[PDB]
Amino acid sequence: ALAKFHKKQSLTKIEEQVGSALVELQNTHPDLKTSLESIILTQVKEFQINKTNKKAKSAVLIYVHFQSYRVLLSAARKLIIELEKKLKQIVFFTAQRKIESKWVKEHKSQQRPRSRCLTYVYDALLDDLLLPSTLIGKRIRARLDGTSFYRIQLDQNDRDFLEEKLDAITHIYKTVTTREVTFEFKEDKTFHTFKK
Amino acid sequence: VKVNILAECLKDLVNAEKMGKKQVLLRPVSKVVLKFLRIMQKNGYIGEFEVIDDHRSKKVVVELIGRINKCGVISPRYDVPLADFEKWTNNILPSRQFGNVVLTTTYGILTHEECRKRHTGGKILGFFY
Amino acid sequence: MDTQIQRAYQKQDGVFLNSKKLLAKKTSAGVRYYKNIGLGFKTPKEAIEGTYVDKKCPFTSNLSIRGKIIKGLVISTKMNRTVIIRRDYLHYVRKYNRYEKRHRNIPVHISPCFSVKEGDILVAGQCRPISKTVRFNALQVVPNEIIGSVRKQFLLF
Amino acid sequence: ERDLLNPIYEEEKQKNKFKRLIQAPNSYFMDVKCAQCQNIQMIFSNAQSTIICEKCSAILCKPTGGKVQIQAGCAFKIKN
Amino acid sequence: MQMKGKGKGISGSALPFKRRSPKWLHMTPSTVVDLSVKLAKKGLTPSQIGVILRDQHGIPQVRFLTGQKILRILKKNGCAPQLPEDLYFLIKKALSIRKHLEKNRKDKDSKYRLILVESRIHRLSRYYKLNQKLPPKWKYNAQTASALVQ
RNA sequence: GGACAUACGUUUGCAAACUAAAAUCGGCGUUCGACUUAGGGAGUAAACAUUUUACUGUGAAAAAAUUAGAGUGUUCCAGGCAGGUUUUAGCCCGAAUACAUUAGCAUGGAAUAAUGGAAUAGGACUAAGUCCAUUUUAUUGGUUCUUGGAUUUGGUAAU
RNA sequence: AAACUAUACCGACUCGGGAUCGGCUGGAAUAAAUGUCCAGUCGGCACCGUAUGAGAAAUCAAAGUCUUUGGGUUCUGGGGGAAG
Numbered sequence: 001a002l003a004k005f006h007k008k009q010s011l012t013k014i015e016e017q018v019g020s021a022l023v024e025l026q027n028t029h030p031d032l033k034t035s036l037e038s039i040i041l042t043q044v045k046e047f048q049i050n051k052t053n054k055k056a057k058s059a060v061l062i063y064v065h066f067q068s069y070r071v072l073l074s075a076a077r078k079l080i081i082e083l084e085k086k087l088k089q090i091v092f093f094t095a096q097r098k099i100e101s102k103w104v105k106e107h108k109s110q111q112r113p114r115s116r117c118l119t120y121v122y123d124a125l126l127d128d129l130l131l132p133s134t135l136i137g138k139r140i141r142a143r144l145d146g147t148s149f150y151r152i153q154l155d156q157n158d159r160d161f162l163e164e165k166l167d168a169i170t171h172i173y174k175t176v177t178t179r180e181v182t183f184e185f186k187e188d189k190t191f192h193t194f195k196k
Numbered sequence: 197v198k199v200n201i202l203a204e205c206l207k208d209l210v211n212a213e214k215m216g217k218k219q220v221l222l223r224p225v226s227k228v229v230l231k232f233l234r235i236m237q238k239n240g241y242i243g244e245f246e247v248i249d250d251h252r253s254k255k256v257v258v259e260l261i262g263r264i265n266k267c268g269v270i271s272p273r274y275d276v277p278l279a280d281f282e283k284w285t286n287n288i289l290p291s292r293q294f295g296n297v298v299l300t301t302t303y304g305i306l307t308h309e310e311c312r313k314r315h316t317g318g319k320i321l322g323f324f325y
Numbered sequence: 326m327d328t329q330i331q332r333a334y335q336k337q338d339g340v341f342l343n344s345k346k347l348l349a350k351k352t353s354a355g356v357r358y359y360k361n362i363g364l365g366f367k368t369p370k371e372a373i374e375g376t377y378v379d380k381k382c383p384f385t386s387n388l389s390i391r392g393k394i395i396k397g398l399v400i401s402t403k404m405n406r407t408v409i410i411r412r413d414y415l416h417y418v419r420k421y422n423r424y425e426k427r428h429r430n431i432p433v434h435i436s437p438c439f440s441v442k443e444g445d446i447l448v449a450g451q452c453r454p455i456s457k458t459v460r461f462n463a464l465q466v467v468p469n470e471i472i473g474s475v476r477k478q479f480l481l482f
Numbered sequence: 483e484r485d486l487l488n489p490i491y492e493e494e495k496q497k498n499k500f501k502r503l504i505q506a507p508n509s510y511f512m513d514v515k516c517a518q519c520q521n522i523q524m525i526f527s528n529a530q531s532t533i534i535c536e537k538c539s540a541i542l543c544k545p546t547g548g549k550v551q552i553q554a555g556c557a558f559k560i561k562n
Numbered sequence: 563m564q565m566k567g568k569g570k571g572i573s574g575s576a577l578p579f580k581r582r583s584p585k586w587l588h589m590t591p592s593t594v595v596d597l598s599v600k601l602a603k604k605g606l607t608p609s610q611i612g613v614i615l616r617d618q619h620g621i622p623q624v625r626f627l628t629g630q631k632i633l634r635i636l637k638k639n640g641c642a643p644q645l646p647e648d649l650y651f652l653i654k655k656a657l658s659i660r661k662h663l664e665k666n667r668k669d670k671d672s673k674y675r676l677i678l679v680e681s682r683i684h685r686l687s688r689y690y691k692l693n694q695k696l697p698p699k700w701k702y703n704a705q706t707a708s709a710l711v712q
Numbered sequence: 713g714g715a716c717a718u719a720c721g722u723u724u725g726c727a728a729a730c731u732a733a734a735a736u737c738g739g740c741g742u743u744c745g746a747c748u749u750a751g752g753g754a755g756u757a758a759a760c761a762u763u764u765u766a767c768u769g770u771g772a773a774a775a776a777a778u779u780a781g782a783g784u785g786u787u788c789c790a791g792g793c794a795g796g797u798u799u800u801a802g803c804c805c806g807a808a809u810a811c812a813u814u815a816g817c818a819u820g821g822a823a824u825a826a827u828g829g830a831a832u833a834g835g836a837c838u839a840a841g842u843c844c845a846u847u848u849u850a851u852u853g854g855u856u857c858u859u860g861g862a863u864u865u866g867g868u869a870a871u
Numbered sequence: 872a873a874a875c876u877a878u879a880c881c882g883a884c885u886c887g888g889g890a891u892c893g894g895c896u897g898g899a900a901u902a903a904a905u906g907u908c909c910a911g912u913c914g915g916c917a918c919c920g921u922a923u924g925a926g927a928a929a930u931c932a933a934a935g936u937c938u939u940u941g942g943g944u945u946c947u948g949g950g951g952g953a954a955g
């Protein structure tokens with residue numbers, strides 16, 4: 001539907017499927033009705049995960065308007081499950097973040113809130129992708145020359161949902177951001193006082 | 197309290213190479229601490245290094261090759277016209293062969309030497325040899 | 326009756342119109358001396374529709390402004406249309422290769438037009454000697470807030 | 483010889499709260515089930531006060547430096 | 563470690579890594595905001611309110627859940643504790659000292675202790691006044707303290 | 713240094729570099745070509761990026777002195793002269809340059825450092841309405857209107 | 872006042888080791904003790920061993936990370952006697 005979009009002009013074959021696909025789920029499943037009623041879309045981008053295997057395995061990332069970001073996270077799990085079943089493609093939800101300029105300030109009486117800065121915006125997606133579960137440890141490495149590798153620590157109990165998307169994420173990030181992102185699984189680090 | 201963590205981090209590190217530590221954990225870290233680090237790294241003094249995300253202000257771990265002889269900062273970071281250079285080169289560096297007096301410019305941070313290339317330099321930051 | 330007499334014994338303008346204006350009984354008679362020192366400076370709205378007779382003003386008189394232009398914080402509001410601005414700069418010390426703090430005090434004349442307040446940044450121009458100290462007139466005033474001591478306040482403005 | 487980036491779990495489990503890398507607390511949260519009403523209330527591992535069961539009004543926990551002793555036989559799961 | 567050339571250590575408290583709200587808990591920011599302001603109305607310190615929400619209703623870190631710091635929540639809802647805990651309390655004991663001193667006009671260790679405590683209060687005033695978070699004409703002398711006693 | 717990538721600017725005028733359409737011209741509606749409007753880089757100049765510090769760079773910092781180029785004052789101090797009559801009623805060549813910190817001016821700037829912008833609220837951008845002020849319209853009125861400022865409202869923005 | 876550690880305060884680092892005083896967390900035996908022990912660990916006197924680190928040395932885990940001379944700040948000295 002052009003309904004579930006903000007620009008409301010024209011959609012792309014991908015964006016279109018996503019629209020009806022969404023409208024589908026709120027009619028089909030009674031539970032996602034409430035949440036999906038709310039959800040609006042900003043834009044959707046498709047990315048090809050090209051591996052040396054000459055295999056074409058694509059997935060698509062969808063930009064949920066910030067207004068519905070709360071809601072999007074509220075049912076995030078179930079939503080992505082159905083969208084992947086109903087589109088046979090890998091699905092990722094992000095927030096539509098607007099980045100502010102560093103030196104291009106123009107409104108004398110306007111300060112650039114850190115909330116919308118490049119470090120913080122680009123760092124956002126990573127949380128968004130692995131979505132269902134947020135990371136435990138994040139790190140940076142400086143290869144001699146000057147590369148920066150982000151080996152990120154992911155929870156063990158989530159090996160399911162995250163192991164698969166794992167390659168897509170890497171590839172979407174390298175495209176949007178510019179950051180190489182390798183992951184590493186570590187058993188969760190429960191630190192409490194076991195007391196028998 | 198604390199001040200010029202670049203100094204905090206720097207000596208903690210020297211104490212490392214000097215004691216023969218195999219690697220170092222620098223507690224309070226900043227952009228500066230890191231830039232300086234990749235400048236030493238780039239010139240080949242320190243080895244690979246990792247920045248852990250302390251949700252407050254990151255902690256860094258630097259591998260120790262074994263070539264660092266000394267790396268400190270300089271008290272107030274005086275200003276230094278390009279004309280003020282030899283003064284400091286003969287002053288801080290152990291020779292006219294290990295030129296590494298890091299400075300801050302408007303053109304960022306350059307090696308004692310690079311500043312002559314870019315032709316500007318400005319305030320002193322630290323040194324390593 | 327107020328702005329005119331108010332103690333002093335008379336207050337006209339540089340352009341002695343007035344009483345004669347009663348000759349042009351139709352158009353606009355209420356003329357006041359109008360000017361524009363220029364130099365990238367706006368002429369105060371308040372300056373125009375005022376009743377004030379300040380000969381020492383840079384918009385209501387044949388008082389020029391030339392060369393030296395200043396920006397400094399204000400110290401005192403006392404004195405009749407005169408204020409003291411304090412500038413805060415650093416001085417270098419050849420030997421120790423460092424600086425010390427220092428402050429010059431300046432006698433500034435204030436045309437009624439702009440409204441003062443203590444502890445605000447002000448912009449002065451270089452006007453001819455108006456008195457022993459005075460040699461600067463206010464041209465642009467910026468209001469600012471300092472919670473307390475003006476002396477404590479030291480800014481490399 | 484030890485790696486400072488991939489430190490042993492035990493080691494870090496011994497160290498002092500603030501000495502561990504990522505640095506996390508020891509405190510935890512627990513669902514307590516009264517010895518009567520049964521009501522399940524959440525209580526913090528380091529309660530700084532006496533706690534009553536909002537159902538009846540029984541006594542569940544006594545405050546101490548750090549630990550919170552649980553009154554009599556009440557149930558407790560460690561939510562995590 | 564404040565006014566102490568010799569004594570110094572580490573009390574505790576280290577916010578866990580994971581910046582999100584605990585799993586087990588469900589509470590629209592609003593839900594909490596009610597408890598917070600309700601609790602506050604009863605006459606509570608944002609300092610104490612947060613304690614309850616942790617000990618009682620398993621809410622470790624209201625800030626992490628709302629995206630709002632307690633005192634802010636409170637100020638937005640008119641339920642703002644006039645004078646900050648900081649100053650308030652210092653002045654409280656600062657006062658308690660004075661009362662005790664009276665009947666013990668000879669207790670010197672206490673004269674001293676008060677000197678330190680009154681010293682601090684002048685340090686907060688300097689601060690809280692500079693953040694236009696307290697009228698400039700504020701002055702703790704003996705009347706500012708007894709003024710709050712009424 | 714460009715460009716592009718949610719990414720250091722916007723307007724102007726110039727120049728412009730290529731492309732998408734429409735026109736005209738030729739051959740046989742189209743294959744193609746030359747020539748027009750639109751389009752930004754790039755290419756300059758003015759207006760903007762909170763305010764300084766600090767650094768670049770040039771304008772200014774008298775001469776003599778110090779450094780220093782040329783130059784066999786018999787070497788030299790040092791002067792600034794001198795070199796070739798074999799074009800000799802004339803020829804050749806010189807009197808250079810640098811340093812000058814501290815404060816002022818022009819100006820390039822991304823680091824550190826300080827300073828500042830939207831938190832009572834209000835801000836921002838935008839449209840309309842209303843009120844005050846106002847340039848050119850010969851001039852004076854009255855309307856309107858351009859241009860500043862004041863508010864109210866509604867829209868937009870991850871307020 | 873030999874008001875003495877004759878050794879300014881704040882801060883970061885770097886050797887080994889047990890024993891302490893205060894608090895905390897796990898555990899074991901008895902027992903079910905405001906006790907005992909084992910193991911951690913913050914914070915506090917102090918000691919033991921040792922330094923291809925410091926010094927004139929006595930000695931110093933800091934009197935160390937200062938010719939490889941620069942974390943922040945306060946106070947003090949400049950041959951002796953006459954003299955505090």
Ligand SMILES: [Mg+2]
Pocket residue numbers: none
């Ligand atoms: Mg200061």
Ligand SMILES: [Mg+2]
Pocket residue numbers: 570571
């Ligand atoms: Mg401490």
Ligand SMILES: [Mg+2]
Pocket residue numbers: none
């Ligand atoms: Mg651009």
Ligand SMILES: [Mg+2]
Pocket residue numbers: none
């Ligand atoms: Mg025990």
Ligand SMILES: [Mg+2]
Pocket residue numbers: none
């Ligand atoms: Mg023990």
Ligand SMILES: [Mg+2]
Pocket residue numbers: none
């Ligand atoms: Mg010595």
Ligand SMILES: [Mg+2]
Pocket residue numbers: none
């Ligand atoms: Mg010893």
Ligand SMILES: [Mg+2]
Pocket residue numbers: 937
């Ligand atoms: Mg020294």
Ligand SMILES: [Zn+2]
Pocket residue numbers: 516517518519520521535537538539540
């Ligand atoms: Zn009960």
